Copies of this chain bind each other. A is one copy, B any other.
Amino acid sequence: ERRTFGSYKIEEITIKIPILDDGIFDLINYLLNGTHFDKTHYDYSHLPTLERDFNTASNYVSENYSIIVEEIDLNKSESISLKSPDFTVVLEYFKKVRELPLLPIMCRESEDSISEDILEGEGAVIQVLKMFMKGFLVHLGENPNSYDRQLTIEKYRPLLISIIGYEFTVNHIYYQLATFDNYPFDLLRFQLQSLIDIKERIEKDGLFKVITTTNARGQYQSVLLRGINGSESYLNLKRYRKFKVRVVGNVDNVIKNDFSSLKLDV
């Protein structure tokens, strides 16, 4: 049941709306367990250390997830969610509700205080997700679709955000890619090339803005990304699911048969 890495899938519904399969839910869940690429749902020549870095990040995410797995009840669905710009995962577990900030880059006054092995773990993680996005876009170019003009990249925004955030906290392409989550596929397929210009000054002084609302019952902090267009965007949650693939097998071994052989009457 393998599939190419960085993939997407397209599903039909009608009473003919299409929907996208992410390639995200599975990646997160695999990273939870430290599963290695060999025993994964996933021809990667131009992907150096794809399994190598992949498994390193799998391991790193595995212990990090275990860090909060310890407190979890045995008894206490799965609706994983992500938040920009520290790129935090969100989980729940019921009887029959926590988070973990995988890549906190908002504020880190421990540049040398944080050990270098941990730093390498994050660097592997970000490399994995970045070239993951690269594979996703090359896959986009590979096999187009009727519905290429029907949906947008909007899912993948925060990952690009984390990309450029690290880049500045160590580009134009990934930046402007993030700039328009509403941007459509076949568009990129046509004009991926010249998307280059703000030039220096709106990002020399912080890539993003932070504003907190004193809602008198809490302090709703919020991040406002800044785009090459010279604009801003609210960062927002996007809870995920994963479609429950049904249990159908395959015709694979069915014995096809001839009919002229049978003495059909005429």
Contacts and interface: CB of A to CB of B under 8 A. Distances in A.
Which of A190, A215, A222, A252 has its CB near the most chain B CB atoms (within 10 A)? A190
Interface residues of A, number: 82
Ranked nearest first, the 7 interchain pairs of A and B with the lowest CB-CB distance are: A232-B249, A230-B253, A194-B194, A138-B259, A230-B254, A78-B216, A144-B254
Contact of A13 (B14, B144, B179, B249): B14
A217 interface: yes
A230 B189 CA distance: 11
Contacts of A193: 194, 262
A191 B191 contact: yes
Contacts of A148: 231, 251, 254
B194 A187 contact: no
A184 interface: yes
A13 to B, nearest CB: 7
A67 interface: no
9 contacts: A16-B248, A137-B259, A141-B258, A141-B259, A173-B265, A183-B184, A192-B259, A193-B262, A231-B250
Which of A145, A248, A255 has its CB near the most chain B CB atoms (within 10 A)? A255
Interface of A: 12-14, 16, 29, 46, 77-78, 127, 130-131, 134, 137-138, 141-146, 148-150, 167, 171, 173-174, 176, 179-180, 182-184, 186-187, 189-195, 198, 202, 209, 211, 213-217, 222, 224, 226, 228-234, 244-260, 262, 264-266
